[PDB]
Amino acid sequence: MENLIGYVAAFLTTVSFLPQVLRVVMTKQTRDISRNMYIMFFLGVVLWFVYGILRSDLPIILANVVTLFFVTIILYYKLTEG
Amino acid sequence: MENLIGYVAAFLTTVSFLPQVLRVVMTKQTRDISRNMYIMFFLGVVLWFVYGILRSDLPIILANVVTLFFVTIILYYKLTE
Ligand SMILES: CCCCCCCC/C=C/CCCCCCCC(=O)OC[C@H](O)CO
Ligand SMILES: CCCCCCCC/C=C/CCCCCCCC(=O)OC[C@H](O)CO
Ligand SMILES: CCCCCCCC/C=C/CCCCCCCC(=O)OC[C@H](O)CO
Ligand SMILES: CCCCCCCC/C=C/CCCCCCCC(=O)OC[C@H](O)CO
């Protein structure tokens, strides 16, 4: 049950960026998105990923590796003339 | 060091929403922000909060209670456009 809530919470925050990734490319707008947010966020999951390794905490390990991918795509789009 | 990394990682992702909160209210624009994202993200941090309790994992407990506040503000603004 500990594990169930971890992987569902992990799924939730991770796949939450997908509607955001989609919105960016379909609407071609990043204007309202904060650069400072995703930048600050990008370093966080990296430190979260390391924390999870040192913690042997898998739901946060899995969550942060996939979230990094999602966040890097939104970050990329925002960084290029947005 | 685990804890050092726990609380900085916590600070980074949590305090990351503040630049977004400010941007929202100062520009008065939320068009590009995804509602499905923040709705989905909101349920997540709550579920992370319980997970953090069950883990006795303090940085993940603290991080998610503070983000919950931040995420609720961006969500309100997004919901009221
Ligand atoms: C006050 C007249 C300008 C004064 C000049 C000094 C800067 C003062 C703050 C303005 C934005 C500076 C950005 C740093 C503050 C973060 C809030 C933010 O929205 O940053 C936007 C960022 O580019 C995400 O896209
Ligand atoms: C790849 C697209 C080609 C075909 C398009 C037809 C189906 C798309 C439906 C429109 C959005 C409906 C919401 C469902 C999509 C979830 C992600 C999304 O961006 O929704 C925006 C939401 O209203 C704010 O967050
Ligand atoms: C210590 C426990 C913290 C846990 C967190 C509970 C999360 C559930 C709701 C969050 C309330 C957020 C309150 C935000 C207050 C400002 C809301 C705001 O955005 O006001 C906009 C204004 O009204 C536009 O006209
Ligand atoms: C820790 C416990 C502390 C408890 C204190 C927490 C206070 C948070 C209050 C906000 C709830 C109301 C927020 C509802 C968001 C806006 C809803 C609304 O305006 O609907 C817009 C509609 O969706 C347009 O289409």
Side-chain angles (χ1 to χ4, degrees), chain A residues 1-61 63-82, chain B residues 1-55 57-81:
Chain A
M1 176 83 187
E2 143 205 343
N3 278 331
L4 165 75
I5 292 177
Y7 283 113
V8 170
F11 176 99
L12 257 15
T13 55
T14 316
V15 174
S16 72
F17 284 105
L18 172 75
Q20 187 66 91
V21 178
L22 280 173
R23 177 160 199 80
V24 166
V25 314
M26 290 278 78
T27 56
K28 286 142 167 46
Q29 308 289 11
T30 44
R31 180 247 278 148
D32 296 328
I33 296 158
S34 188
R35 176 189 358 189
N36 288 337
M37 164 156 91
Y38 278 80
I39 289 190
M40 261 181 88
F41 198 94
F42 174 92
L43 288 350
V45 340
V46 164
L47 271 305
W48 271 124
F49 168 64
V50 171
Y51 180 73
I53 294 288
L54 267 289
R55 270 285 158 188
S56 308
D57 211 291
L58 278 56
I60 98 131
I61 285 169
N64 291 290
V65 168
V66 189
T67 303
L68 193 54
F69 181 75
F70 275 115
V71 168
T72 309
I73 301 173
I74 297 157
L75 190 35
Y76 178 88
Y77 274 102
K78 163 49 115 161
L79 249 46
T80 60
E81 71 166 54
Chain B
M1 180 79 187
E2 140 204 339
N3 276 331
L4 166 75
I5 289 177
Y7 284 113
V8 170
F11 176 103
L12 265 14
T13 56
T14 184
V15 175
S16 71
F17 281 104
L18 173 75
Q20 186 65 92
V21 176
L22 276 171
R23 176 162 198 79
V24 165
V25 316
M26 291 281 325
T27 58
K28 285 143 166 199
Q29 314 264 58
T30 43
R31 179 201 64 198
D32 298 330
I33 302 291
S34 188
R35 177 186 47 124
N36 288 337
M37 158 130 102
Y38 278 80
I39 289 189
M40 263 179 87
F41 200 87
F42 169 88
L43 293 173
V45 314
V46 164
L47 274 195
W48 272 125
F49 170 65
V50 257
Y51 183 73
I53 299 287
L54 269 37
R55 271 285 160 187
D57 207 289
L58 284 203
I60 195 153
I61 288 168
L62 174 73
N64 291 291
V65 163
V66 189
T67 58
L68 189 48
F69 179 75
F70 279 116
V71 168
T72 311
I73 299 172
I74 298 156
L75 191 35
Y76 177 92
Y77 275 101
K78 217 289 138 104
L79 284 173
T80 60
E81 82 164 277

